[PDB]
RNA sequence: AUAAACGCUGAAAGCAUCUAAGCGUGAAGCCCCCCUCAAGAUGAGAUUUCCCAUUUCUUCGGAAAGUAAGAUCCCUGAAAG
RNA sequence: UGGCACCUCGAUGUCGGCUCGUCGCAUCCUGGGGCUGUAGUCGGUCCCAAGGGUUGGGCUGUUCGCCCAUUAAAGCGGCACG
């Protein structure tokens, strides 16, 4: 019958700047993972990309409650026999703050072909300055 | 904690958020703190406060007063740590500023004064450490004593003035 | 540090002052010219580009005629880079001579090994043979390829393939005699590669 | 339809659970298919329905 | 140091403390030092 | 930078305590240093240099057809296979 | 060492050795440390630690075992008793 379905390019996609100082790692990522998805628009369509672009600054000041700065471990395997490598969350925040936030959000997005598309929509900067001033983003206040 | 301290003559105190500093004849010191204590400023009887009074506040109450007491008294009198040498052939020179110890090793060991702490060696069998930081002065003396701690049989090695060295009787 | 490029000429031996006899390697290092300097601002890393042998203008093409024209030199055949080297020296277009080294220096030699074709396990990886008698039929074979449980064969199960041709460096290799009229430099020991092969000489890293 | 009514209702300081309670408590019997249609095409009328939902919740 | 699941004082001069979130006994006699 | 371990200052608890806030030493181990591969790292990076803006058709995406810098087919070969 | 009899009897090859290894730590050597009935040399016990290393022969089909001679040491187990 008659139910509205969006089309690629029909919905205007905006740019947002989110400041991430003091916010918990998983509380920030959960809200960002639904901005990219498009779950805040009545034009939502499950099979079409209709979200927004998100820029995250101050990625080095993210929050890690409790003993997560030492007891949280990130694992990687190279598929060679006995090639398991690990890094704590505390030093990852110190050295590579951009990788910590990308790994968290990437697990919060659908694990399909369109879920990879939304990942390329995210830019994370460990400092306080971003290179995307030509796109004229706005300041988005987290709820 | 909750006690009071007295600013001596020549000592100045300024505050900036959780950061404080003290200038005195011996030198100057700087430190950070936790904002939740809200240091109480007075004419001279400086203290702090406990806005919450729970488990993690009574512990933090005492430390703030005690260390500021250390910081203030540090620039007025200074801190001293004394050491002695026991054992035949255990005897130390002084080559200018570097401290040299002959403690029976096949090689000598060298020591250098840190930033703001001074080592003097009055007698060949005694060593004195002085500085305007209790934390720094105490640490330096520990490193010197750690070369050869007092062995329990004949008392050989560096020691403090009041170490009740446990003594055994081998064989 | 310092570095030059050269061609492997061969091997011979010399007699030292003490009377001992040692083998040496002969290096031809003519026509080295500094071509380009790479800075942090321009590139992000510090390096110097060196060109080794001139070649006929027919073999050189248009794009590399203009690359060497900045340093005012004829087109070269080998071009490489050296890192962790001081940049106060090395003016553009300056010749680089063998006398930047001296007697009894310590260098590192980098080159491309000699080529062997399709080689089996006991020559490529130095494995063992099976018995050649007592009724066996296992002579020069790889071996068991792993346990049953994984349902697959792991990685780094060493197997035949093309053997040589990789880049190999040899460290802490001493220099015996240096000659500036012949542009000849003598290194005690062996360096990888066949005759006429490029050999990159650099000061020891350790 | 539920995910589209939710997204439109949040723009008016509401949520789906607390909006659909207001409508029942006020007597409106419009189903999800029609409610989502207004939220996308004629958002002007969706707000009029949402205002009545807020009145039912308060009184 | 004795590492056993049953740390308890042996003499009258023994003391029980807690460091780094575990129970241990420190005493003047070095033979009495225990950790859980 | 750490494990076990040894300490400094220090309160809860006016004393004491290596701990709770904060600091210092401390392993053939961890990350580096060393050697090799590595931009299909679809996140496909950077630098130096070279060629330049032609002709037929278009109603529109654009289509084709001689070239420039450059490469290859073909032939003599080995330091490669 | 056993108990059960759940997949396989229109076939799941069964001991020992050879070639090739990889993993666990309840550590044989090497590294750091606490206690000692730790004077010194030589040791004993426990904590952290899996990076590397961990022999050649005589007898027996032998795994194992005994013996000769060495070594810093001649580890214990899993992978269809790989
Ligand atoms: Mg190359
Ligand atoms: Mg045969
Ligand atoms: Mg490129
Ligand atoms: Mg020939
Ligand atoms: Mg069958
Ligand atoms: Mg263990
Ligand atoms: Mg040991
Ligand atoms: Mg011991
Ligand atoms: Mg090991
Ligand atoms: Mg015989
Ligand atoms: Mg079995
Ligand atoms: Mg078997
Ligand atoms: Zn006791």
Automatic annotation (TrEMBL), chain A:
Gene Ontology molecular function, alphabetical: mRNA binding; structural constituent of ribosome
InterPro entries recorded: Ribosomal_uL13, Ribosomal_uL13_bac-type, Ribosomal_uL13_CS, Ribosomal_uL13_sf
PROSITE patterns reported in the protein's UniProt record: RIBOSOMAL_L13
One GO biological process term: translation
Alphabetic keyword roster: Ribonucleoprotein, Ribosomal protein
Any Gene Ontology CC annotation: cytosolic large ribosomal subunit
Pfam families noted in UniProt: Ribosomal_L13
NCBIfam families, alphabetized: rplM_bact (TIGR01066)
Subunit structure comment from the entry: Part of the 50S ribosomal subunit.
Function field: This protein is one of the early assembly proteins of the 50S ribosomal subunit, although it is not seen to bind rRNA by itself. It is important during the early stages of 50S assembly.
Family stated for the protein in its record: Belongs to the universal ribosomal protein uL13 family.
Protein's UniProt name: Large ribosomal subunit protein uL13
The organism of origin for this protein: Listeria innocua
Gene for this chain: rplM
TrEMBL record, chain B:
Domain Large ribosomal subunit protein uL6 alpha-beta: 7-78, 86-160
Alphabetically ordered keywords of this record: Ribonucleoprotein, Ribosomal protein, RNA-binding, rRNA-binding
GO biological process: cytoplasmic translation
Family matches, as InterPro entries: Ribosomal_uL6-like, Ribosomal_uL6-like_a/b-dom_sf, Ribosomal_uL6_a/b-dom, Ribosomal_uL6_bac-type, Ribosomal_uL6_CS
GO molecular function, one term: rRNA binding
SUPFAM superfamilies recorded: Ribosomal protein L6
Keyword DNA repair attributed: no
Organism domain of life: Bacteria
Cellular component terms (Gene Ontology): cytosolic large ribosomal subunit
The UniProt record lists the keyword Amino-acid biosynthesis: no
Biological role stated in the UniProt entry: This protein binds to the 23S rRNA, and is important in its secondary structure. It is located near the subunit interface in the base of the L7/L12 stalk, and near the tRNA binding site of the peptidyltransferase center.
Family: Belongs to the universal ribosomal protein uL6 family.
Oligomeric and partner information: Part of the 50S ribosomal subunit.
Annotated protein name in UniProt: Large ribosomal subunit protein uL6
TrEMBL record, chain C:
GO biological process: translation
UniProt entry tagged with the keyword Metal-binding: yes
Molecular function as annotated in GO: rRNA binding; structural constituent of ribosome
Residues bound to Mg(2+) 2: 139
UniProt xrefs under InterPro entries: Ribosomal_uL3, Ribosomal_uL3_bac/org-type, Ribosomal_uL3_CS, Transl_B-barrel_sf
GO cellular component labels: cytosolic large ribosomal subunit
Positions with a binding annotation for Mg(2+) 1: 115
Protein origin, superkingdom: Bacteria
UniProt-listed PANTHER family: 50S RIBOSOMAL PROTEIN L3 (PTHR11229), LARGE RIBOSOMAL SUBUNIT PROTEIN UL3C (PTHR11229:SF16)
Family (UniProt): Belongs to the universal ribosomal protein uL3 family.
Function as written in the Swiss-Prot or TrEMBL entry: One of the primary rRNA binding proteins, it binds directly near the 3'-end of the 23S rRNA, where it nucleates assembly of the 50S subunit.
Record-linked HAMAP family: Ribosomal_uL3_B
Name listed for the protein in its UniProt record: Large ribosomal subunit protein uL3
Gene name of this polypeptide: rplC
UniProtKB/TrEMBL annotation, chain E:
GO cellular component: cytoplasm; ribonucleoprotein complex; ribosome
Residues holding Zn(2+): 11, 14, 27, 32
SUPFAM superfamilies found in the cross-reference section: Ribosomal protein L36
Leader sequence segment: none
Pfam entry (one): Ribosomal_L36
Gene Ontology molecular function: structural constituent of ribosome
Keywords recorded for this protein, A-Z: Metal-binding, Ribonucleoprotein, Ribosomal protein, Zinc
GO biological process terms held by the UniProt record: translation
Domain of life: Bacteria
Keyword Ribosomal protein: yes
Family: Belongs to the bacterial ribosomal protein bL36 family.
UniProt-recorded name of the protein: Large ribosomal subunit protein bL36
Species of origin: Listeria innocua
């Amino acid at each position: 019958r008659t139910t509205y379905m969006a089309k690629p390019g029909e919905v205007e996609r905006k740019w947002y700047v989110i400041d991430a100082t003091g916010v918990s790692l998983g509380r920030l990522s959960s809200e960002v993972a639904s901005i990219l998805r498009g779950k805040n628009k009545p034009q939502f369509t499950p099979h079409i990309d209709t979200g927004d672009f998100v820029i995250i600054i101050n990625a080095g000041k993210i929050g890690l409650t409790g003993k997560k700065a030492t007891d949280k471990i990130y694992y990687r395997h190279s598929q060679y026999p006995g090639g398991l490598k690990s890094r704590t969350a505390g030093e990852m925040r110190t050295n590579n703050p951009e990788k910590l936030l990308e790994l968290s959000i990437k697990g919060m997005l659908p694990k399909n072909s369109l879920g990879r598309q939304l990942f390329k929509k995210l830019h994370v900067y460990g400092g306080s300055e971003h290179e995307h001033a030509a796109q004229k983003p706005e300041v988005y206040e987290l709820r | 904690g909750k006690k009071t301290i007295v600013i001596p003559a020549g000592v100045t105190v300024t505050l900036n958020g959780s950061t404080a500093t003290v200038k005195g004849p011996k030198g100057e010191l700087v430190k950070e703190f936790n904002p939740e204590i809200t240091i109480n400023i007075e004419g001279n009887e400086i203290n702090v406060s406990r806005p919450t009074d729970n488990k993690n506040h009574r512990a933090l109450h005492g430390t703030t007063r005690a260390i500021l007491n250390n910081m203030v008294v540090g620039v007025s009198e200074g801190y001293e740590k004394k050491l002695e040498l026991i054992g035949v052939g255990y005897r130390a020179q002084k080559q200018g500023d570097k401290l040299v110890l002959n403690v029976g090793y096949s090689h000598p060991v060298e020591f250098v004064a840190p930033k703001g702490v001074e080592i003097e060696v009055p007698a060949n069998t005694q060593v004195i450490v002085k500085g305007y930081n209790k934390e720094h002065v105490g640490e330096l003396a520990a490193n010197i004593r750690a070369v050869r701690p007092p062995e329990p049989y004949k008392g050989k090695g560096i020691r403090y003035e009041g170490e009740h060295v446990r003594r055994k009787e081998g064989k | 540090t310092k570095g030059i490029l050269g061609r492997k000429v061969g091997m011979t031996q010399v007699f030292t002052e003490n009377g001992e006899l040692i083998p040496v390697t002969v290096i031809e290092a003519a026509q080295n010219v500094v071509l380009q300097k790479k800075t942090v601002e321009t590139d992000g890393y510090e390096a110097v580009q060196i060109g080794f042998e001139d070649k006929r203008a027919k073999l050189s093409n248009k794009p590399e005629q203009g690359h060497v024209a900045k340093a005012d030199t004829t087109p070269k055949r080998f071009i490489r880079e050296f890192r962790d080297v001081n940049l106060d020296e090395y003016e553009i277009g300056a010749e680089v001579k063998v006398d930047v080294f001296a007697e009894g220096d310590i260098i590192d030699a980098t080159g491309v090994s000699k080529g062997k074709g399709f080689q089996g396990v006991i020559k490529r990886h130095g494995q063992s043979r099976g018995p050649m008698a007592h009724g066996s039929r296992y002579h020069r074979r790889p071996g068991s390829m792993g346990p049953v449980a994984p349902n697959r064969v792991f990685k780094n199960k060493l197997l035949p393939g093309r053997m040589g041709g990789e880049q190999i460096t040899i460290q802490n290799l001493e220099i015996v005699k240096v000659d500036v009229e012949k542009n000849v430099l003598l290194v005690k020991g062996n360096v990888p590669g066949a005759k006429k092969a490029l050999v990159q000489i650099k000061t020891a890293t350790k | 339809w539920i995910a589209r009514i939710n997204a439109a209702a949040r723009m008016q300081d509401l949520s789906y659970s607390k909006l659909m309670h207001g409508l029942k408590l006020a007597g409106i019997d419009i189903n999800r298919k029609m409610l989502a249609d207004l939220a996308v095409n004629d958002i002007a009328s969706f707000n009029t329905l949402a205002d009545s939902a807020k009145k039912a919740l308060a009184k | 140091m004795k590492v056993r699941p049953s740390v308890k004082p042996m003499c009258e001069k023994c003391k029980v403390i807690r460091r780094k979130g575990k129970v241990m006994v420190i005493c003047e006699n070095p033979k009495h030092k225990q950790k859980q």
